[PDB]
Design a protein around this nucleic acid. Structure first.
Ligand SMILES: [Mg+2]
Ligand SMILES: [Mg+2]
Ligand SMILES: [Mg+2]
Length: 801
RNA sequence: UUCACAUUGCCCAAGUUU
RNA sequence: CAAUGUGAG
């Protein structure tokens, strides 16, 4: 439970492919530079950046001589040459167009220590050095553009991109400094997010309430209109010179609205001497709730550069997607255009520190791994061969297909829309596809009844269970999006323990062989079948001893939410294929990534593995989704020990080797085909199986990019895998092949998915817990805990399929 | 609620005188 | 998983 293992070696498996990556090489000088600790009394980050930039111009002659200090926005200051004050304190103060600021100088950043650590000589990558370089690259754009996370956004000049509702698209780019096997690298990627337009509040009202012009509404707002407007502007800032956080939209129109004893229209009529157009419309209530200052819509401006944190509307989203949808070559060229346009070398603050940035994307050589063969059953024992990460189920039967003899249907769609004919049609079509797949639906359903409302579910289901012995499955037709779905799964998964398979009504009226086939995949698994397996003799050597494959993920509540729990999920392989998985799930602290009750969850799974296979795992392979580099030590420290605790409290001296792997699907590394005839499909992406464990990866540690999936649309996200611990001493080859093969064991489709199945199931388990908790989200905890606790008959199934 | 892929929503980060 | 797109035997 200490620092991660070193890179054991480099992969050798697979044919080579020429790739470009959105990493731009950095030439860093071999000099020392100087860290200073600031403290400003009393502020937003951008306000503090402003204090220093004005302060440096003001104490130029006294202190900062021809220097270009960079400032991280709070209390870290860096200079290329030392400041003529030495080792001691200084208390300065600056003017606002009020601030005492303290400058010390704690440290000297060696820099040349970075080159040596990048050479692997020094085991440690010095973080406090990498911190400093990022502050260099961020200093200037942090004031010109509008920061959001590690990115930067600005209004596109020459073009506008409205979304409606007073919003518009702002294009921008992500920026980050990372170390690598080769050099320091600048990772750049284009991005876009919704912003509020800096228009008159009057015109803001118009876009939200759907007026072409002011004069449509001539007398004060409707009850309906004043709340809808209020909901949209409250929390946004506005300007007149001066700043104001909008806090409320008043009840009375300006002319009638009053403050102590004068009225705002009257107040503006003589003090600032302008009658109001639109005296009918109300006033904004600004700043403090306790205080009584009210502002007219007329004189107000929506202040520029405020990110839109509310969820977009559906047509707003449509507009956003349409604007930013981009094939991989188009993506590549846009990154390139931006970077030649950025001209990071001209940046004076960059120039101060003598940093040089490469004009072009780095060239990197990847390898394309071979897909494993997939083994089906029935009589043929057919073998399927993934081609460009895809295969099909025609002319093949499940390795272990379930014979279905007792089953029922429950339609919650209106009969006028979903008729008995449609159901009968759909049934015959399904039975056909299912027999071909080795999953004979041997008879007609023993039950078929229309229903309406979530109220009718539990009684209908309790009936079925009490009546039809050996009942295997209930198929449930739904009219579309409905609360019934959440209800059907609550009763099935948690209350009665009954297999259910829902189908949207539209996919019943009109069915297709592909859709029905994918449906049988889900069904056969839910009823304990094995769809396929990896070709046994084609697996890596690790399968020669008993091994369990764990997948784990946390899912946090949406943006803006304050009290909903985070949900941890852990699944474990239950056979030697590996194919069958059992799941565990927990509610835990709001926005905690660390899986709190992991040890209990792993113990549960280890026991079930033994009852299933009658083997004890000699090794445990742990795939952990979603952890960032910043949280690697904390998570590993807690979660690695939790796995050990599980093993130790199970049996004395039961110490299986642990391999701990973090899976990151969401980062800002993008890989492109250098050679045009390597591109795959309309989107023009790199092929499935593409592997990069050199050049752009970590200088000392064990990590690699693997893109295991076909890229249908946009630009593919190659998944990054990072090994935080490995008792089993894997080689790069074996772990990459293992990880790649597990992307083929995902039962919901005949494709190679973007992450290993165990981790993918961990997502599906979490998301299902989220469905159990809909509108239900010491005594607080136990209620939610029980909401996600599945029935005893469900515990050992793949209900999450 | 057939499914995958892609944009966003998720930990880190970011943000927090009328 | 939700919204929105692109796709499949
Ligand atoms: Mg997660
Ligand atoms: Mg924070
Ligand atoms: Mg969707």
């Amino acid at each position: 439970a200490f620092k991660p293992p070193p890179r054991p070696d480099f992969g050798t498996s697979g044919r080579t492919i020429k790739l470009q990556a959105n990493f731009f090489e950095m030439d860093i000088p071999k000099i020392d530079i100087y860290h200073y600790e600031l403290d400003i009394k009393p502020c937003p980050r951008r306000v503090n950046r402003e204090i220093v930039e004005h302060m440096v111009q003001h104490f130029k002659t006294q202190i900062f001589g021809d220097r270009k200090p960079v400032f991280d926005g709070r209390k870290n200051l860096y200079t290329a040459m030392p400041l003529p004050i030495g080792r001691d304190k200084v208390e300065l103060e600056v003017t606002l167009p009020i601030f005492k600021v303290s400058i010390k100088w704690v440290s000297c950043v060696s820099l040349q220590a970075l080159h040596d650590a990048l050479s692997g000589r020094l085991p440690s990558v010095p973080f406090e050095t990498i911190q400093a370089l990022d502050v260099v690259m961020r200093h200037l754009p942090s004031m010109r553009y509008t920061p959001v996370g590690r990115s930067f956004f600005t209004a596109s000049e020459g073009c506008s991109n409205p979304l409606g509702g007073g919003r518009e698209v702002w294009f921008g780019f992500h920026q980050s400094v990372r170390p690598s096997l080769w050099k320091m690298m600048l990772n750049i990627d284009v991005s876009a997010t919704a912003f509020y337009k800096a228009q008159p509040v009057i015109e803001f009202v118009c876009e939200v309430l759907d007026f072409k012009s002011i004069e449509e509404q001539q007398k004060p707002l409707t009850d309906s209109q004043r709340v809808k407007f209020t909901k949209e502007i409250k929390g946004l800032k506005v300007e007149i010179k001066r700043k104001y956080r909008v806090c409320n939209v008043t009840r009375r129109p300006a002319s009638h609205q009053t403050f102590p004893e004068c009225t705002v229209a009257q107040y503006f009529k003589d003090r600032h001497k302008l009658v109001l157009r639109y005296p009918h419309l109300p006033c904004l209530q600004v700043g403090q709730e306790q205080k009584h200052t009210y502002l007219p819509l007329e004189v107000c401006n929506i202040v520029a550069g405020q990110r839109c944190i509310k969820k977009l509307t559906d047509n707003q989203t449509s507009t956003m997607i349409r604007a930013t949808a981009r094939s991989a070559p188009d993506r590549q060229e846009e990154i390139s255009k931006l970077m030649r346009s950025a001209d990071f070398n001209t940046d004076p603050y960059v120039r101060e520190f003598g940093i040089m940035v490469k004009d072009e994307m780095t060239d990197v050589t990847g390898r394309v791994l071979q897909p494993p063969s997939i083994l089906y059953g029935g009589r043929n024992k057919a073998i399927a061969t993934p081609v460009q990460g895809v295969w099909d189920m025609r002319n093949k039967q499940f390795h272990t297909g379930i014979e279905i003899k007792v089953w029922a249907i429950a339609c919650f769609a209106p009969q006028r829309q979903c008729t008995e004919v449609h159901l009968k049609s759909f049934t015959e079509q399904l039975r056909k596809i299912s027999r071909d797949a080795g999953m004979p639906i041997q008879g007609q359903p023993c039950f078929c009844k229309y229903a309406q409302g979530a109220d009718s579910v539990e009684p209908m289901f309790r009936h079925l269970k009490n009546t039809y012995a050996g009942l295997q499955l209930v198929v449930v037709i739904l009219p579309g999006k409905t609360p019934v779905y959440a209800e059907v799964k609550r009763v099935g998964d948690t209350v009665l323990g009954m297999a259910t398979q829902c189908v949207q009504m539209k996919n019943v009226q009109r069915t297709t062989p592909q859709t029905l086939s994918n449906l049988c995949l889900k069904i056969n698994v839910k009823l304990g079948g094995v769809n396929n397996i990896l070709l046994p003799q084609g697996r890596p050597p690790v399968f020669q001893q008993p091994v369990i494959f764990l997948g784990a993920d946390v899912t946090h509540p949406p943006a803006g939410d304050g009290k909903k729990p985070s949900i941890a999920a852990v699944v474990g392989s239950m056979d030697a294929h590996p194919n069958r998985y059992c799941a565990t799930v927990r509610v835990q602290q709001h926005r905690q990534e660390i899986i709190q009750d992991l040890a209990a969850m792993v113990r549960e799974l280890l026991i079930q593995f033994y009852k299933s296979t009658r083997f004890k795992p000699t090794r445990i392979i742990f795939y952990r989704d979603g952890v960032s580099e910043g949280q690697f030590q904390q998570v590993l420290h807690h979660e690695l020990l939790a796995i050990r605790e599980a093993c130790i409290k199970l049996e004395k001296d039961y110490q299986p080797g642990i391999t701990f792997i973090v899976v990151q699907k969401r980062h800002h590394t993008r890989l492109f085909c250098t050679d045009k005839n390597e591109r795959v499909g309309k989107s023009g992406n790199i092929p499935a199986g593409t592997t990069v464990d050199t050049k752009i990866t970590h200088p000392t540690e064990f990590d690699f990019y693997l893109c295991s999936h076909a890229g249908i649309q946009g630009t593919s996200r190659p998944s990054h895998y990072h090994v935080l611990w490995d008792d089993n001493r894997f080689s790069s080859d074996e772990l990459q092949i293992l990880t790649y093969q597990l992307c083929h064991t995902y039962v919901r489709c005949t494709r190679s998915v973007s992450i290993p199945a165990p981790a993918y199931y961990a997502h599906l388990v979490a998301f299902r817990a989220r469905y159990h908790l809909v509108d239900k989200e010491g005594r607080d905890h136990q209620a939610l805990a029980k909401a996600v606790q599945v029935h005893q008959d469900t515990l050992r199934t793949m209900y999450f399929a």
